[PDB]
Amino acid sequence: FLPFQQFGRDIADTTDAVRDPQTLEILDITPCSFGGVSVITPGTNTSNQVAVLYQGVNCTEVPSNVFQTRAGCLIGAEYVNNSYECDIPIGAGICASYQTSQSIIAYKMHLGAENSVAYSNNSIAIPTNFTISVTTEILPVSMTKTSVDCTMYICGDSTECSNLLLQYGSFCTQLKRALTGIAVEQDKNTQEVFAQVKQIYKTPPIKYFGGFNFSQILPDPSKPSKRSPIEDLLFNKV
């Protein structure tokens, strides 16, 4: 410090150094340790053991199996040298799992299987067979349409509350129009996706297409809802 200066301030305007009034000495001030506490579990179905992670603290303050990672202090897990596919993410490339009796272990994430391609300036690879693959993709379309009555929610049934509220200006009008716009948007979203065809086409009564079986995705007349089996499964699941 300069001889007349008494304490030191930071960029954020927080005191970080001080001068002792008796001995002309400078001291650094450091905040006391704090952090978050998280629990890692394999599910009460699988076991009742847990591990505990203290985030962003040195392992010397938490006073078993103790480990120090860039995420913080880990207690109750055994560190190994293997590498598996990640199961429970911890942070900075560290993952945890429940492995062999049985115990909680920690390890490094494994990116994948190592492979090398025999490259040469003279050789090629040509396939001799093929496979037909079917895959599923799921996409949400719309959400629930809600409406709110502002006066009944705020003032219930009393009257002078409404008299006080109307002094606050036009604040109830802008909420209704936003909610109505959202509802109209949902209705437009459904139409944009599903109403793409002009006419309703029908399958021939004789369902033969050269040996291809489409019964799993075609409508089932027996069911009153007239849905396909896959559609019924999806409907019942949610």
Partner 1 sequence: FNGLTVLPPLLTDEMIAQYTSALLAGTITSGWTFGAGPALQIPFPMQMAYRFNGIGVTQNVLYENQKLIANQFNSAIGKIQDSLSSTPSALGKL
Partner 2 sequence: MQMAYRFNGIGVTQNVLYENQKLIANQFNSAIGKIQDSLSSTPSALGKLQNVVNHNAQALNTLVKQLSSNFGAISSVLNDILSRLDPPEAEVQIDRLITGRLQSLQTYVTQQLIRAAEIRASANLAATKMSECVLGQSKRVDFCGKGYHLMSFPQSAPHGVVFLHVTYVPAQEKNFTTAPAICHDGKAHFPREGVFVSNGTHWFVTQRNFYEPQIITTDNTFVSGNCDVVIGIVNNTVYDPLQP
Ligand X SMILES: *[C@@H]1O[C@H](CO)[C@@H](O[C@@H]2O[C@H](CO)[C@@H](O)[C@H](O)[C@H]2NC(C)=O)[C@H](O)[C@H]1NC(C)=O
Q: Does 37 bind partner 1 (CB under 8 A)?
A: no
What is the CB-side half-sphere exposure of residue 111 using CA atoms within 13 A? Answer: 2
Q: Answer yes or no: are the C-beta atoms of 228 and 216 closer than 8 Å.
A: yes
- DSSP H or E run through 182: helix 173-194
Asked if 69 and 77 count as a contact pair (C-beta separation under 8 A), the reply is no
Q: Which partner, ligand X, ligand NAG, partner 2, none, binds residue 159 by CB below 5 to 8 Å per kind?
A: none
Per-residue x/- marks for ligand NAG, 6-45, CB under 6 A?
A: ----------------------------------------
Distance of closest approach, residue 162 Cβ to partner 2, in angstroms = 10
- For residue 212, state whether it binds ligand NAG (rule: CB under 6 A): no
Considering only CA atoms, give the Rg of the chain: 33
Which of the choices partner 2, ligand NAG, partner 1, none does residue 45 contact, using the CB cut-off of 5 to 8 A by kind? none
> Residues 12-31: x/- map of binding to ligand X (CB under 6 A)?
----------x---------
Member of 30, 44, 115, 196 binding a copy of itself (CB under 8 A): 115
Please tell me the distance from the alpha carbon of residue 193 to that of residue 62, in angstroms, as a whole number: 55
Residue 6 or 180 having the CB closest to partner 2 = 180
Give the number of other CB atoms < 10 A from CB of residue 76: 19
Q: List the interface residues with a copy of itself, window 168-197 (CB under 8 A).
A: 187, 197
Angle value at C-alpha 72, between 67 and 77, nearest 5 degrees = 35
CB closer to partner 2 out of 2 and 134: 134
CB 115 within 8 A of CB 167: no
Name the residues that contact a copy of itself, by CB under 8 A.
89, 111-117, 119, 121, 187, 197-204, 208, 210
